[PDB]
Design a protein around this motif. Structure first.
Motif, PDB file in Angstrom:
ATOM      1  N   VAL A 140       0.779  -1.259   0.000  1.00 12.13           N
ATOM      2  CA  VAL A 140       0.000   0.000   0.000  1.00 12.13           C
ATOM      3  C   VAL A 140       0.811   1.311   0.000  1.00 12.13           C
ATOM      4  CG1 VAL A 140      -1.625  -1.295   1.421  1.00 12.13           C
ATOM      5  CG2 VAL A 140      -0.312   0.528   2.483  1.00 12.13           C
ATOM      6  N   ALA A 141       2.051   1.254   0.468  1.00 15.10           N
ATOM      7  CA  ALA A 141       2.986   2.362   0.374  1.00 15.10           C
ATOM      8  C   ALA A 141       4.376   1.762   0.292  1.00 15.10           C
ATOM      9  CB  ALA A 141       2.855   3.298   1.568  1.00 15.10           C
ATOM     10  N   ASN A 142       5.282   2.422  -0.422  1.00 19.80           N
ATOM     11  CA  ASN A 142       6.631   1.895  -0.540  1.00 19.80           C
ATOM     12  C   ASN A 142       7.271   1.746   0.834  1.00 19.80           C
ATOM     13  OD1 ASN A 142       9.812   2.899  -1.997  1.00 19.80           O
ATOM     14  ND2 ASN A 142       8.945   0.858  -1.654  1.00 19.80           N
ATOM     15  N   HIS A 143       7.631   0.504   1.159  1.00 22.68           N
ATOM     16  CA  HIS A 143       8.300   0.161   2.417  1.00 22.68           C
ATOM     17  C   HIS A 143       9.445   1.114   2.786  1.00 22.68           C
ATOM     18  CE1 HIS A 143      11.708  -1.436   0.269  1.00 22.68           C
ATOM     19  NE2 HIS A 143      12.167  -2.131   1.292  1.00 22.68           N
ATOM     20  N   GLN A 144      10.495   1.191   1.982  1.00 23.91           N
ATOM     21  CA  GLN A 144      11.587   2.100   2.261  1.00 23.91           C
ATOM     22  C   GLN A 144      11.141   3.549   2.429  1.00 23.91           C
ATOM     23  OE1 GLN A 144      12.660   4.538  -0.340  1.00 23.91           O
ATOM     24  NE2 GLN A 144      13.685   3.273  -1.856  1.00 23.91           N
ATOM     25  N   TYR A 145      10.217   3.989   1.580  1.00 23.53           N
ATOM     26  CA  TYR A 145       9.579   5.299   1.724  1.00 23.53           C
ATOM     27  C   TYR A 145       8.925   5.398   3.108  1.00 23.53           C
ATOM     28  CZ  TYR A 145       5.297   8.289   1.274  1.00 23.53           C
ATOM     29  OH  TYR A 145       4.264   9.180   1.466  1.00 23.53           O
TER      30      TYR A 145
ATOM     31  N   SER B  78       5.382   0.006  -7.571  1.00 25.20           N
ATOM     32  CA  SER B  78       5.782   1.415  -7.567  1.00 25.20           C
ATOM     33  C   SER B  78       6.136   1.945  -6.174  1.00 25.20           C
ATOM     34  CB  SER B  78       4.677   2.277  -8.178  1.00 25.20           C
ATOM     35  OG  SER B  78       5.138   3.588  -8.444  1.00 25.20           O
ATOM     36  N   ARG B  79       6.841   3.070  -6.126  1.00 27.06           N
ATOM     37  CA  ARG B  79       7.211   3.675  -4.849  1.00 27.06           C
ATOM     38  C   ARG B  79       6.122   4.593  -4.322  1.00 27.06           C
ATOM     39  NH1 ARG B  79      10.177   7.244  -5.312  1.00 27.06           N
ATOM     40  NH2 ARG B  79      10.356   7.490  -7.586  1.00 27.06           N
ATOM     41  N   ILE B  80       5.155   4.894  -5.176  1.00 28.98           N
ATOM     42  CA  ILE B  80       4.170   5.914  -4.858  1.00 28.98           C
ATOM     43  C   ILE B  80       3.193   5.414  -3.805  1.00 28.98           C
ATOM     44  CG2 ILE B  80       2.659   7.651  -5.840  1.00 28.98           C
ATOM     45  CD1 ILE B  80       5.371   7.594  -7.117  1.00 28.98           C
ATOM     46  N   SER B  81       2.917   6.259  -2.820  1.00 22.22           N
ATOM     47  CA  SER B  81       1.945   5.923  -1.793  1.00 22.22           C
ATOM     48  C   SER B  81       0.572   5.811  -2.440  1.00 22.22           C
ATOM     49  CB  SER B  81       1.940   6.976  -0.683  1.00 22.22           C
ATOM     50  OG  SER B  81       1.510   8.235  -1.175  1.00 22.22           O
TER      51      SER B  81
END
Lengths: 222, 210
Positions: A140-145, B78-81
């Motif tokens: 649901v959201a980039n882990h590292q992010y 993707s990196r996007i939330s």
DNA sequence: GAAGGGCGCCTATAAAAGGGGGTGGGGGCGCGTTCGTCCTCAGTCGCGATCGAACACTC
DNA sequence: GAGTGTTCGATCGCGACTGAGGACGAACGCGCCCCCACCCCCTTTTATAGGCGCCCTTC
């Protein structure tokens, strides 16, 4: 008495040693040496026109290896040591070389088995996988992010300017080490916007390309 | 000799690299490429991250192909939330002025049951169970995927191919309690929700409770 | 120790202000690359100097 | 008779002439770091519902 000092005693004693080549499977039997380290007994028979040496395994080690004598001519061989106390010593000169070989105890099949036995590996070959579909979870959201987020929320670079003074003092500290510094490095000591920082570096200094293009700043010589 | 397009040019490589990870049909990707090109040509949303727009274009195309993929899935590639994708999504709907469609549970019955290697009969039974449940609005709250997973669970629990909620939960991504809640909502009608063409492996009476 | 269920938390939207951020677009200065220019030596021949030699004038 | 001075021939030294090779540079080239420009980002309250993480307890 020195580390690089080599003892020559053995050589000067003309001390002789014997050199014997031994197969690994036998040597593996020998790592299991019986008792303190005994592995068996050596038998030597010499006649007027024939000389026979062989070794027989310890009965314990068992749970005839004839020797082939080889020349040491053409190359002088001596043995030199390194102690666990790193002291160096020459024990002797090699007076005999020899090789342990099989005799009337094997044709090939056991050796083949022995080779097989030593291996015991899949060589690395790709043995299937057969078939899988290990699809990967959507987070649901980039882990590292997200990991970035726990860190990001702790502190901001948007800090305050109560420092038309603490920063110049720090400048004396840095420039005491070298006359000039890169702007990014100046930014590292600071915790303030570069534009504001630009306002400071203009105030007590000028800048360069230093012959390296880089906006390098230094304190005013005047 | 083309700096302006270079982020767009790279975005379609990244679109392709995003379609690559889950073996997407090229027709979908092409519309997506066309969607971005259109979004690019507007430039009104130039103040936005390209990769989010690409990912949002991707979510839309799947819906445009009548086979949406969850943001959760779209997040995986993707990196996007999910928030920023949803945000960008709205902006694109407004940007391109085009409508969308509502989701259906059956569209995900295929791959999930596939991922569980469940036979079509269970898969189809689940779909009816789901279909009957939504027509009756037995679950006016829970997400249809959450509702679908519990139906799948119920179905799997009605066959020998039973699975633990956590495994199902792990496959759907939903919370194991959310299925547990959704299950509590569908359980009163567990017996009658099943299709008329079904062969129990466990009596509805013997259906577990949680 | 490990599994489990319950408590409670987060999120999603709406609306704006002040201060720092950030990305994009644009640009400048240094380092890297390649071909051409410049420098030099070797080789042959013309040219100038030097050695070889005969005739005329003075002692 | 004899001794000394001058000049063309001949002989030898010279440099000019042409090309190839080695080293150099300058035009061409590469990319990063600089900066301005454009525009998001953060906070609260009030209302709501879906999803959800963590703890406590029990196995």
């Amino acid at each position: 008495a020195e580390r690089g000092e080599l003892d020559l005693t053995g050589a000067k004693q003309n001390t002789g040693v014997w050199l014997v080549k031994v197969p690994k499977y036998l040597s593996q039997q020998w790592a299991k040496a019986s008792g303190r380290g005994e592995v068996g007994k050596l038998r030597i028979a010499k006649t007027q026109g024939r000389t026979e040496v062989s070794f027989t395994l310890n009965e314990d080690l068992a749970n005839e290896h004839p020797f082939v004598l080889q020349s040491v001519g053409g190359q002088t061989l001596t043995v030199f040591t390194e102690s666990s106390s790193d002291k160096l010593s020459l024990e002797g000169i090699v007076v005999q070389r020899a090789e342990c070989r099989p005799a009337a105890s094997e044709n090939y099949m056991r050796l083949k088995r022995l080779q097989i036995e030593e291996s015991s590996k899949p060589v690395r070959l790709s043995q299937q996988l057969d078939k899988v579909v290990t699809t990967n979870y959507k987070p649901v959201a980039n882990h590292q992010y997200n990991i970035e987020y726990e860190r990001k929320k702790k502190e901001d670079g948007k800090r305050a300017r109560a420092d038309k003074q603490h920063v110049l003092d720090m400048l004396f500290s840095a420039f005491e080490k070298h006359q000039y510094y890169n702007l990014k490095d100046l930014v590292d000591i600071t915790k303030q916007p570069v534009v504001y920082l630009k306002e400071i570096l203009k105030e007590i200094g000028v800048q360069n390309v230093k012959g390296i293009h880089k906006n390098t700043w230094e304190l005013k010589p005047e | 000799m083309s700096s302006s397009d270079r982020a767009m040019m790279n975005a379609f490589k990244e679109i392709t690299t995003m379609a690559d990870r889950i073996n997407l049909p090229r027709n979908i990707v092409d519309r997506t490429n066309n969607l971005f090109k259109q979004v690019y040509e507007q430039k009104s949303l130039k103040g936005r991250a390209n990769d989010a727009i690409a990912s949002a274009c991707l979510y839309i195309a799947c819906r445009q192909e009548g086979v949406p993929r969850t943001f959760k899935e779209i997040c995986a590639v993707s990196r996007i939330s999910k928030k920023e994708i949803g945000r960008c999504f709205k902006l694109i709907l407004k940007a391109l002025e085009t409508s969308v469609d509502l989701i259906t549970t059956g569209d995900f019955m295929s791959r999930f049951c596939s991922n569980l290697c469940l036979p079509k009969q269970v898969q189809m039974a689940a779909t009816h169970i789901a279909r009957k449940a939504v027509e009756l609005d037995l679950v006016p709250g829970r997400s249809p995927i959450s509702v679908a997973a519990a139906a799948i669970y119920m179905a799997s629990q009605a066959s020998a191919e039973k699975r633990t909620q956590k495994e199902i939960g792990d496959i759907a991504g939903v919370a194991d309690v959310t299925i547990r809640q959704s299950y509590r909502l569908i359980y009163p009608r567990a017996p009658d929700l099943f299709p008329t063409d079904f062969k129990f492996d466990t009596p509805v009476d013997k259906l577990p409770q949680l």
